[PDB]
């Protein structure tokens, strides 16, 4: 009966003007359906390349939704457990043997049981409950004690971002991880994705200070190492200083008792940036439950995993 601040027709024609063009079909079924598609193709190239108003019209009409790269790995189905969550940040340990048809990756629970086997709360019992034997992952890695003696464990672990597609097989499980770009679902349709980090290995740097990048942090504690995950919206180049300050109350306090030799053991931990999620969406705590018990878990949506290099603290 009255007039709105917006007419529907003007908004309708504005949306129709700013609409992307349809993707070009090409029927390989019938030749009568093929000649119209190839005529549309040659007319599209003609009106997109001839020097007239049609070229600049179609050039402004184009929008640039690029698909991210994906990492296809083959891991042992016994060295993995498919009961874990989808969006878990995997860590491909570098295998020096070229005579290896498969590779080996690591969920944080697996390297957590590796650090606990090298030497807690509920997550250590959850990791013992998920991966029942640390001996499997212990003899999966060839040189664990030696490479942690020389402290080059960090460049032998390359983070491959979160896990999205994970099939389930008897032998030789295949996993698919997004490495660069936005996390998204590839085989299962491209709707939504999350990143599950264990909350006990994930601490907020800015809450300790009291975009949104995410940092993976190895530390070499003097009885055996540990991973921790750091979220901070601060600088890409001013993350080393604040984390140096954060690990300062521990380093000499447990480093008074140790002294190196045959020189190694000076590098105290190393840190890479897994990538960035948006400052709009925060991280929402949830619960990760195996069939024995449950564990708190942190969900991070809309990630853009851009894995950097490990940087020593």
């Amino acid at each position: 009966k009255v007039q709105g601040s917006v007419d529907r027709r003007r908004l309708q024609r504005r949306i129709a003007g700013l609409l992307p063009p349809p993707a070009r079909r090409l029927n390989i079924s019938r030749g009568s359906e093929f000649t119209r598609d190839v005529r549309g193709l040659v007319e599209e190239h003609a009106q997109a390349s001839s020097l007239s108003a049609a070229a600049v019209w179609r050039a402004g009409l184009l929008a640039p939704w690029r698909p991210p790269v994906f990492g296809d790995f083959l891991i042992h189905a016994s060295s993995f457990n498919n009961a874990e969550a989808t969006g878990t940040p995997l860590f491909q340990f570098k295998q020096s043997d070229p005579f290896s048809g498969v590779d080996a990756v690591f969920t944080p629970l697996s390297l957590f049981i590796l650090m606990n086997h090298g030497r807690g709360g509920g997550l250590t019992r959850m990791a013992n409950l998920l991966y029942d034997s640390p001996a499997t992952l212990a003899d999966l890695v060839p040189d664990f004690g030696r490479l942690v003696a020389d402290r080059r464990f960090h460049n032998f672990i390359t983070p491959v971002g979160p896990l999205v597609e994970n099939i389930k097989s008897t032998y030789l499980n295949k996993i698919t991880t997004v490495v660069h770009g936005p996390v998204v679902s590839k085989a299962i349709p491209r709707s939504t994705v999350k990143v599950t980090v264990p909350q006990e290995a994930f601490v907020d740097l800015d809450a300790w200070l009291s975009d949104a990048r995410l940092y993976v942090a190895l530390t070499y504690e003097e009885a055996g190492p540990r991973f921790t995950f750091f979220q901070s919206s601060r600088g890409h180049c001013q993350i080393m200083n604040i984390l140096r300050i954060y690990y300062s109350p521990s380093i000499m306090h447990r480093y008074a008792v140790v002294q190196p030799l045959h020189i190694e053991e000076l590098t105290f931990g190393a840190v890479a940036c897994l990538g960035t999620f948006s400052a709009t969406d925060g991280w929402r705590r949830s619960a990760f439950n195996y069939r024995g018990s449950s564990l708190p878990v942190v969900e991070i949506d809309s990630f853009y995993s851009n894995v950097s290099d490990w940087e020593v603290i």
Binding site: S78, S96, D97, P98, D139, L140, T170
Partner: protein, 76 residues
């Protein structure tokens, strides 16, 4: 059913054939070289292949890969 072991120098948990080819004492080795009995004396490979055969047989019972010849952990 009668002979527990024909070769007592490789079949124990810490015997001679075990301690030079299993990965628990193969830390200071070069990984670029290939060793054919690593598929036979890695304890994790034996448990892995046996569990894989078990769940494959069980999975085909419940219904209704690089090498098939390494399923049976035997040489010829």
């Amino acid at each position: 059913e009668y002979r527990s072991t024909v070769n007592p120098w490789a079949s124990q948990l810490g015997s001679l054939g075990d301690i030079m080819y299993n990965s628990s004492y193969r830390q200071t080795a070069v990984p670029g070289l290939y060793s054919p009995c690593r598929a036979f004396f890695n304890k994790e490979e034996l448990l892995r292949n046996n569990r894989g055969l078990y769940n494959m047989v069980n999975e085909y019972s419940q219904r209704l890969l690089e090498q098939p010849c390494s399923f049976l952990q035997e040489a010829f």
